[PDB]
Amino acid sequence: GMPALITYRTTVQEDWVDYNGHLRDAFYLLIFSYATDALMDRIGLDADSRGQSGNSLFTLEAHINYLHEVKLGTEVWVQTQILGFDRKRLHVYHSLHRAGFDEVLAASEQMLLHVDLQSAPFGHTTVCRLNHLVEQQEGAQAPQYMGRTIKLPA
Amino acid sequence: GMPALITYRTTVQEDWVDYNGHLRDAFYLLIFSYATDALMDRIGLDADSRGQSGNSLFTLEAHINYLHEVKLGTEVWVQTQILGFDRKRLHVYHSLHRAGFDEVLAASEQMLLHVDLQSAPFGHTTVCRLNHLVEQQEGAQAPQYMGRTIKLPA
């Protein structure tokens, strides 16, 4: 039973935390952005041009749920699932994790556009690598924080 | 007819952009985070403690729509509306703008929790300042990017 896809690991640094030592909201999203870039390295998307490493993707839209504070020095990693894709868009879900705590710290659903240099289609090879990764998701935990909308409690 | 509330202004710096000179997705959210902090300075929330300047707020959840790329050196500002609040939560909407272009570059709906030092109620004075700001929103453009959900085009 194969482990989840981990795309990115880092240690929370002092320039990402507030006075009280908690990871600022935007820097959870930064860690996920770096994860998106690493996912593009893995599938070699536009690897030989300035579009490499996520540079050819424009994030259209993202939701993020923050379930837990993350303190200075915490070692964290990102898990990433591909929810869907079409000729030029990728639908992805990142979750943030740490050792010894078995629920997500944060999760984000995102839609990304492949852009020319104005959008550009995914080539046959990219599609094949995306399908390969997707096939390897049969064991993954289903994405919880999907289709989310904000409201004050009644 | 009174102008919109501007909470934050900055110039996009080289450490926020990708190889192609475009603002990375997470750094739109960083600019909005700083805007949230400045909003808390304006209403003086926990001004005399380590909770000052947004430190006593935990972002629970956020959506962000990215309508336009933002290039290196662009002077941008944030507009902020208070959509609602209860005893301990603030519902806010930030939009990103630049001179000479009259649609939003990006927008984000967020829900934030006031936390003790575990949550804490807003005091009478905070509520009065929040109501004052809200009253000044009669002229504001209605928030467009609300209740948004992600989907691939059919």
Side-chain angles (χ1 to χ4, degrees), chain B residues 89-111:
Chain B
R89 281 159 290 265
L90 186 57
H91 188 194
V92 302
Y93 181 83
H94 295 300
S95 57
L96 191 69
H97 305 256
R98 68 181 181 78
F101 186 73
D102 60 328
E103 61 185 79
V104 301
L105 305 178
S108 184
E109 188 189 1
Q110 319 197 335
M111 181 73 69

Side-chain angles (χ1 to χ4, degrees), chain A residues 124-150 152:
Chain A
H124 179 265
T125 302
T126 298
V127 172
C128 289
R129 300 174 182 165
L130 288 171
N131 289 330
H132 181 70
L133 281 179
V134 169
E135 288 166 38
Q136 295 178 324
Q137 299 177 174
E138 296 308 307
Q141 184 128 292
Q144 186 177 351
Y145 297 92
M146 299 273 267
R148 295 300 185 113
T149 58
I150 290 157
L152 294 167

Side-chain angles (χ1 to χ4, degrees), chain A residues 100-116:
Chain A
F101 186 73
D102 60 328
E103 61 185 79
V104 301
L105 305 178
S108 184
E109 188 189 1
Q110 319 197 335
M111 181 73 69
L112 310 136
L113 177 63
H114 185 224
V115 304
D116 186 50

